[PDB]
Amino acid sequence: MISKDEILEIFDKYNKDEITIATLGSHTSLHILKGAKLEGFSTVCITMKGRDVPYKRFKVADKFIYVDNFSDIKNEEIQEKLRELNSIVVPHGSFIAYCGLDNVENSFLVPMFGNRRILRWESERSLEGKLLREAGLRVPKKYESPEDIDGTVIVKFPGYFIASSTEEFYKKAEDLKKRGILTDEDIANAHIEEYVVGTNFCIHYFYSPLKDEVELLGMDKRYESNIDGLVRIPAKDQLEMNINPSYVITGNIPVVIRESLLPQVFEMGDKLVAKAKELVPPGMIGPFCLQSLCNENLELVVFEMSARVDGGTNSFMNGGPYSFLYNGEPLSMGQRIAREIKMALQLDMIDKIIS
Amino acid sequence: MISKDEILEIFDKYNKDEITIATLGSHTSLHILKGAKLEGFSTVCITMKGRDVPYKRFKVADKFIYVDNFSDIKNEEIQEKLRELNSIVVPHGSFIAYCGLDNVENSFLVPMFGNRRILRWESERSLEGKLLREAGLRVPKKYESPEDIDGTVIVKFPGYFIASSTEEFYKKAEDLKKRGILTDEDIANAHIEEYVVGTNFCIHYFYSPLKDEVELLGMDKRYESNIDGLVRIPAKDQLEMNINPSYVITGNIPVVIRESLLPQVFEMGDKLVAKAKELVPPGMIGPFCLQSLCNENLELVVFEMSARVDGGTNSFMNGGPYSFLYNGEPLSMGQRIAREIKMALQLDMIDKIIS
Amino acid sequence: MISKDEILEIFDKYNKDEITIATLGSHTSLHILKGAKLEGFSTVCITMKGRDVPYKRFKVADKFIYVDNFSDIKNEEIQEKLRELNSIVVPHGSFIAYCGLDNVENSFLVPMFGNRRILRWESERSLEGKLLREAGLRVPKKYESPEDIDGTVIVKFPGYFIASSTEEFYKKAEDLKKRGILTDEDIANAHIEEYVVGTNFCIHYFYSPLKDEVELLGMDKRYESNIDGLVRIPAKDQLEMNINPSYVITGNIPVVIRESLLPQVFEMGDKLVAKAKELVPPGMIGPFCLQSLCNENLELVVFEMSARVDGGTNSFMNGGPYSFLYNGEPLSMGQRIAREIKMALQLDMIDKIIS
Amino acid sequence: MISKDEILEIFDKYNKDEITIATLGSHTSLHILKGAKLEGFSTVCITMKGRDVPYKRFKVADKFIYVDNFSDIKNEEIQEKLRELNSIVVPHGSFIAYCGLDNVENSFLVPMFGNRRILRWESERSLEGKLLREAGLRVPKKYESPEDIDGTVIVKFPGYFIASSTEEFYKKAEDLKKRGILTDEDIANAHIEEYVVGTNFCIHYFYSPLKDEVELLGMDKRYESNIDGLVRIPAKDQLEMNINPSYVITGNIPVVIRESLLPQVFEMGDKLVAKAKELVPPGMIGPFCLQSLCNENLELVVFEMSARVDGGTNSFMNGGPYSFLYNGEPLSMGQRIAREIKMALQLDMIDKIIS
Amino acid sequence: MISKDEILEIFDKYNKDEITIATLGSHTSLHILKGAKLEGFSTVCITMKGRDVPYKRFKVADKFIYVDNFSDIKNEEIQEKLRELNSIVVPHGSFIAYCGLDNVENSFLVPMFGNRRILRWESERSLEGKLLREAGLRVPKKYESPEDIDGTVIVKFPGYFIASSTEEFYKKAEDLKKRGILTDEDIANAHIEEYVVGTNFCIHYFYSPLKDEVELLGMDKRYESNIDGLVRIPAKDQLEMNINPSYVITGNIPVVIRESLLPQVFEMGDKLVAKAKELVPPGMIGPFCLQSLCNENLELVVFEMSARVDGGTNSFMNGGPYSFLYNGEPLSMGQRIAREIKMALQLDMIDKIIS
Numbered sequence A, B, C, D, E: 001m002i003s004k005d006e007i008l009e010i011f012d013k014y015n016k017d018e019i020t021i022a023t024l025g026s027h028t029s030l031h032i033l034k035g036a037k038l039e040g041f042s043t044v045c046i047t048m049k050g051r052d053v054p055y056k057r058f059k060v061a062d063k064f065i066y067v068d069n070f071s072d073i074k075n076e077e078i079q080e081k082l083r084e085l086n087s088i089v090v091p092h093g094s095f096i097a098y099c100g101l102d103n104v105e106n107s108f109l110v111p112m113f114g115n116r117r118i119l120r121w122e123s124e125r126s127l128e129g130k131l132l133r134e135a136g137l138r139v140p141k142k143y144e145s146p147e148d149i150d151g152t153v154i155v156k157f158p159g160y161f162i163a164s165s166t167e168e169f170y171k172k173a174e175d176l177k178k179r180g181i182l183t184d185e186d187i188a189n190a191h192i193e194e195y196v197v198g199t200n201f202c203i204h205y206f207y208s209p210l211k212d213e214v215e216l217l218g219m220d221k222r223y224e225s226n227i228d229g230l231v232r233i234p235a236k237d238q239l240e241m242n243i244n245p246s247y248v249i250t251g252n253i254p255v256v257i258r259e260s261l262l263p264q265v266f267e268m269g270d271k272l273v274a275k276a277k278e279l280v281p282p283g284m285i286g287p288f289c290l291q292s293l294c295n296e297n298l299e300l301v302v303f304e305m306s307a308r309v310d311g312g313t314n315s316f317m318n319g320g321p322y323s324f325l326y327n328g329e330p331l332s333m334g335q336r337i338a339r340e341i342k343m344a345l346q347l348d349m350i351d352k353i354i355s
């Protein structure tokens, strides 16, 4: 519901000489806040007791807004402190969750870097799949029901398993049921897709509305538990175990792609951006990630995407091999965001980057 | 056939005040061209439509030479543009392939960084094995025929499989045949070697003919599809699949070796360089890679080598842990190459580095 | 036995205008010595023939003290050269081993960065376990005997295997016996613990006695042979092999943790430091590492620790994502150590950092 | 009157996680505020309409406190805003004047970098002369009355002229009287001293109470109007003019001293600092300037001093030849001040640097 | 008398892994020693009590060799310490004076950066004038005797005055005699030359024997006492004084030349270098200064030169406008010298730079 004009008029009461960058202390905020300082900004960190130490010891925040629980960040009281500080908020995974995506879309009256509307399109698998399919991107083959399974599939519930047949599907669902991990309602909405066998590249892009350009900033591969620990056990020993794989994100590892695949990499970002302009105007604004798998035919297949900054940007907080090429600098995504905020304030084009 | 004097006399007609660095837009050209700019050079990128975006958006090339297909880079027309631009060409994997190694050796009349003759020694498994064996380096044990198999082996055809017996060899060859991946002629020339079980270090060295020194620049491990995706599937599920491993390079991951192994690391490069001087004068010039596996006895076994810059240098385009030690700089291999070109022009010793 | 006053009075005869940093040429000495140079120090490297090349080519040492074998570094002759050079010695894994931990504790009369006494607490599994348990840290569940095994365990002998039952334990012990890898005396003291299935984070901390603060410097995951090569073999092929896993450290790979887990990360270091002050005064001084595994419940379980600089700091010799946040610099652990030595000399507080 | 305990207890109610650096927008505030940002601080600038542009366009201040006139900076309202911002104030020439030195000494209840008491000793020519004389420094010879004049003298009134005799003194005083530049009361308190003929070095020092050390940061020579414009007129033309010299500071020019004179330079700062400890405890804190003239006998004679930061530090806001030697950095005095504030907060020694 | 082979054979007994840079603590040693550290060298400073503080507080020397008086630096004892430290000595104005130029030429058996023989050519006005005249450089017109004076001249004695006639010459000589500044023997050897009226540029060049190139590093103007203080007194007041000008170097001020005059600037260095090769082989090595005055016809007239590093390089110890152009670095002359020492050691060409 929140209007653009409604947000531009909040920002107009802002002291344009004292624009700060704010965010929630979690997810990717260390380089969001570091990147801001490096660009000249004073920074605001929403934090809480027991969770504030990393931001205090890394010296990355100038002002703290302590909440009782991160859930309070929807409260109109915190919105006020943020407006009085002239903060532009940089959204990220954790902020959207603790604030709630409905509160974000029509109850959070603080200026926000990026296209506010499009945060819904990453939250819903149908919108996400619609976008990736319509943008012309390779995605895993989808399966309507367990009876349609004719290969190895992975099965996700909004807590994960692999199946190579209809029969294996139910045996495994049953296991995860009689172990108190999945209720009958989760499996009633099981999402089944082709298991893509390949190398993980989570590709971090930045779309600049100022330059009208998609940029490559970096790449990581996920480090997930228990799976990346499960597959480190020798095959003979794994068979002696009664252990199911889980896919809980615990961290990230840096990777570079084969250089001949960069034309495919940019075309993917270009296409995604050209379609999102049509479907959710103005489209992708700033940081976005295609989480893909590269098969043996050197084709990147995208199984996920983010419409804002992705946790994997943490793997290059001191810059990376791709962020370096632009200007020989240790450039993070956080700093690339802050720079866009800076240039837009200087060119009087803040309307291209906030909502 | 191309003579050294034949190349020195092409370079003598060069305007020594305007020496550019050229390369093909692929493989490792992003840091070759970035590294050149950082050293003061103007840069030339051979590119083509649909494949030029990465070089335009990374702002790494000053002049583009567009070809219809990269195969045209042998054409005497492109050789002329390069000579008129006073370009020294930096060779790499992709350039040699698209240009053709015979065209490189006697039909490509543009000055080239490195020892031109020695590019043949990396192309032929017999020359390569000859060199590594004569340099005194550990290599996988070789097997003349499937009947000689007495352990786990890996089998390569100039598309890969593992066997632990003669019987398994044929069963697998048959599979890859009746699946249209290998013709009877490929398996007629199957290369069988010991499967080395260990940690991958692709070690990137630079030999300076100016300093008469082998330098350590960095290290990566390969990220290959489908294999690195295959082994991420739990053992129980893998057994339910009918899937063969492939070993297609898709990218790279940074790694550092145990420091006590660096004396072995340098001795390997020293030895390789001392033997290549004898076998293919003047020997190794500039960048070279030993692709090795470290067994549990802390011995590096080399299964491959490159006689020019290797794709893994991309993992440290913003510098790495070893390239940093020299001068505290974000030094890439591309920039280390450009620096040698610079120093040689300044010391009037271009004859030590081109051919 | 070596007293603090005994060491302060050695250091008092030091020319305070010419303080050098010394260490043994191995383990982590490349960034210890590089970091020192960067902070203004002249550096001393204990090295030997055949093992000195890495330090000569990286140009990281100003003065060499050549020994016949690294075992000689206990010799009172080498202690004298070090005292005459005004060297503070930075201890590390290799130095303690070659010098011998008893010689370190009462026969090595050279000033040393860190708490000398506490190097014993990392050497003994009982002290180490005592400390981690009393500090309140999660550790693997321990097993008194093979008959207590009720899950997957890993078994270590001061050369490793996994067991999922009492029966499997003996079958495997027998195998490693009848293969000449373990004598009956090793298995008589077998250390059996819970096999933690998860993602490896070796977390590198620095405790500053000057700032009274625990800092996060970086993180790596181990790269071990043959295990990380064993699990890269497809499950079907592994079953055709008669191969046991080994866990020999060969190198390291960079990783970042999920940012929401940093509060747990710092609390772990804080707790460890607060307990070590009580148990071994003054406690942890400078660099320390918690080597942990993150399970699917996002809990870090510590299976090992170091009470000095850990080999994994090599993964960020050119700085890392966390070391960057402080001041936007390529900061290594080696340089963080040297800086503390520098600040302490400038503030006349060398008594807070040496022993 | 303002007590130290009275100031420590104001600072104790400060949020130690959000310490800002404040100052008045004038004099030397550009590098005071720039230097602060570079050290990680958020900055507060006291400014006013018509005088705020330089600080807005140089992007050097995060928060502005607008006053009606700089005279309002004594007002208890502005003191409150400063306390609520957790600001340490950095004093300078302009701040003391607009605030009034009595208000500074007992009516300005905001923490302040430096020794508050000693700002009186630079304001009074008797205290200043007492200090320089007792510290053992060369100063111009003083003259009790016009009748004591036996050489070339310069005559100052708290607007300047040169005399070489008693007679010339009165003729000139009369001129400046019958021209409405000096009243009979100014000349009733005329300060007459030896005219020192030599080269101007305004030497900028920093005393660190943390390191107990006097540091050399830089040097400038004054650029004064109309005098430096008067002496640029050829002698023949000057004689055709009826023009008196004035000595109004308009700017500064960088200079380096002859290196053999640096031992004299440091001894002067050392001596000044050792005497000020006795006379006005704790003595000199942070930045101080000896404004001297070097005669042909290579002796520096001091005609003025500042007990805080001097305007000449502006000549090296991007660092200078001496500030560079420490760490190869573009270090300004402003940044050297901010660093001391930083280190003191980190070492819990804020009591050594504020009052 | 000292031979080159005699010096090469001293240097051959040097540990080539531990080459240090040494110099006397005075003149230009701050950037000589800083520049060395920046290039990776350990540094040796010859100093003495009462004169060592600047080098201790600037942290620029790793090892001190204390002498009783700087005159002792000729002593064979100090030569030994320097040889045992593997020091290459960098000569400068003060070192040559305290050591004595005869001792330098045949009694100082330590390797020395530059052409040892040519230090005599800067010491003798006849050799100096011979060189500048034969190199084809503009110099002041010379006058054989006071009776030849037909314009404004300046008169120098190996303490200075200006004369516009024969009569004025004697009146002034008489004054300086009856004031005890000049004996009858000084004026018996008075050197009289054209007074050049113009702007002072002391131009600092570096000749690289490695690159065979003359480089422009920077420029300063002298700051001399009492003269630059004398001319700051208004003309009317100067006439009321009985004061003679002196020209004692006290410091330096940075200046840049008009860019259209750089072709003249380089040709002057080129010419000087081409003639010095013939007259004193191998010629100019490393740093040299032409001290010139630019007349209204935009012609640089050289009144002095140095055959080693000149004191004016101190004006750009943090780099300057010209030293910046090469690589965008804060490059001093001291660091440019150290770099040449570094490159020569790396290229095995130390024979091009020492003697």
Ligand SMILES: Nc1ncnc2c1ncn2[C@@H]1O[C@H](COP(=O)(O)O)[C@@H](O)[C@H]1O
Residues within 6 Å of the ligand: A140, A154, A156, A193, A194, A195, A196, A197, A222, A224, A247, A303, A304
């Ligand atoms: N289509 C797929 N094929 C193979 N692995 C997948 C697929 N989708 C997800 N995964 C793995 O499951 C993890 C969690 O996926 P998601 O919850 O979709 O982000 C991913 O990071 C992948 O490692």
Ligand SMILES: Nc1ncnc2c1ncn2[C@@H]1O[C@H](COP(=O)(O)O)[C@@H](O)[C@H]1O
Residues within 6 Å of the ligand: A026, A027, A093, A094, A097, A249, A250, A251, A252, A310, A311, A312, A314, C257, C258, C259, C260
């Ligand atoms: N390092 C990371 N890599 C990838 N995804 C992440 C990372 N950190 C957080 N996320 C995602 O963002 C969500 C919120 O993060 P958290 O607050 O850490 O639970 C998680 O559910 C993850 O899907």
Ligand SMILES: Nc1ncnc2c1ncn2[C@@H]1O[C@H](COP(=O)(O)O)[C@@H](O)[C@H]1O
Residues within 6 Å of the ligand: B140, B154, B156, B193, B194, B195, B196, B197, B222, B224, B247, B303, B304
């Ligand atoms: N001797 C070997 N033992 C084990 N793995 C190998 C061996 N040779 C090659 N490989 C794997 O196969 C991939 C392709 O090898 P190549 O085609 O020889 O460069 C390598 O990157 C290795 O990961």
Ligand SMILES: Nc1ncnc2c1ncn2[C@@H]1O[C@H](COP(=O)(O)O)[C@@H](O)[C@H]1O
Residues within 6 Å of the ligand: A257, A258, A259, A260, B026, B027, B093, B094, B097, B249, B250, B251, B252, B310, B311, B312, B314
């Ligand atoms: N990132 C890389 N790592 C290792 N080898 C590579 C890499 N990129 C390319 N290569 C090798 O160079 C050849 C040509 O590269 P491409 O043009 O990308 O196919 C390939 O066949 C690979 O063997």
Ligand SMILES: Nc1ncnc2c1ncn2[C@@H]1O[C@H](COP(=O)(O)O)[C@@H](O)[C@H]1O
Residues within 6 Å of the ligand: C140, C154, C156, C193, C194, C195, C196, C197, C222, C224, C247, C303, C304
């Ligand atoms: N409790 C455990 N659970 C699983 N793996 C372990 C455990 N302890 C050690 N390891 C693995 O064995 C290697 C050697 O362990 P350690 O010798 O205890 O340092 C470690 O780096 C781990 O990869």
Ligand SMILES: Nc1ncnc2c1ncn2[C@@H]1O[C@H](COP(=O)(O)O)[C@@H](O)[C@H]1O
Residues within 6 Å of the ligand: B257, B258, B259, B260, C026, C027, C093, C094, C097, C249, C250, C251, C252, C310, C311, C312, C314
């Ligand atoms: N890169 C590394 N990562 C982790 N641990 C290491 C590393 N290097 C050495 N160590 C440990 O330090 C000990 C001595 O090292 P080394 O002298 O290399 O054998 C080894 O036994 C290892 O446990």
Ligand SMILES: Nc1ncnc2c1ncn2[C@@H]1O[C@H](COP(=O)(O)O)[C@@H](O)[C@H]1O
Residues within 6 Å of the ligand: D140, D154, D156, D193, D194, D195, D196, D197, D222, D224, D247, D303, D304
């Ligand atoms: N004793 C002196 N001899 C010569 N010039 C002076 C003397 N004192 C002050 N001046 C000049 O007058 C200017 C103003 O001096 P003051 O007002 O004392 O700071 C100084 O910057 C000097 O250039």
Ligand SMILES: Nc1ncnc2c1ncn2[C@@H]1O[C@H](COP(=O)(O)O)[C@@H](O)[C@H]1O
Residues within 6 Å of the ligand: D026, D027, D093, D094, D097, D249, D250, D251, D252, D310, D311, D312, D314
């Ligand atoms: N650039 C400068 N150099 C030397 N002294 C200065 C400078 N700027 C200001 N001052 C002194 O500080 C006082 C206050 O400065 P202002 O507010 O600029 O008048 C002046 O009376 C000067 O004596």
Ligand SMILES: Nc1ncnc2c1ncn2[C@@H]1O[C@H](COP(=O)(O)O)[C@@H](O)[C@H]1O
Residues within 6 Å of the ligand: E140, E154, E156, E193, E194, E195, E196, E197, E222, E224, E247, E303, E304
């Ligand atoms: N020919 C000349 N004409 C005018 N001024 C000169 C001349 N030679 C020397 N001077 C001045 O006298 C100072 C001392 O000169 P010198 O002792 O020759 O280095 C120089 O720095 C000049 O400022």
Ligand SMILES: Nc1ncnc2c1ncn2[C@@H]1O[C@H](COP(=O)(O)O)[C@@H](O)[C@H]1O
Residues within 6 Å of the ligand: D257, D258, D259, D260, E026, E027, E093, E094, E097, E249, E250, E251, E252, E310, E311, E312, E314
């Ligand atoms: N800063 C400087 N500028 C020009 N010449 C200098 C400088 N410092 C020293 N010299 C010359 O070098 C000689 C020795 O310097 P000193 O030991 O400082 O007397 C002096 O006689 C000067 O001629």
Ligand SMILES: [Cl-]
Residues within 6 Å of the ligand: A203, A204, A205, A287, A288, A289, A308, A309, A310, A313, A333
């Ligand atoms: Cl992203």
Ligand SMILES: [Cl-]
Residues within 6 Å of the ligand: A093, A306, A309, A310, A311, A312
């Ligand atoms: Cl995310």
Ligand SMILES: [Cl-]
Residues within 6 Å of the ligand: B203, B204, B205, B287, B288, B289, B308, B309, B310, B313, B333
């Ligand atoms: Cl390479």
Ligand SMILES: [Cl-]
Residues within 6 Å of the ligand: B093, B306, B309, B310, B311, B312
């Ligand atoms: Cl390659």
Ligand SMILES: [Cl-]
Residues within 6 Å of the ligand: C203, C204, C205, C287, C288, C289, C308, C309, C310, C313, C333
């Ligand atoms: Cl550590």
Ligand SMILES: [Cl-]
Residues within 6 Å of the ligand: C093, C306, C309, C310, C311, C312
């Ligand atoms: Cl270790």
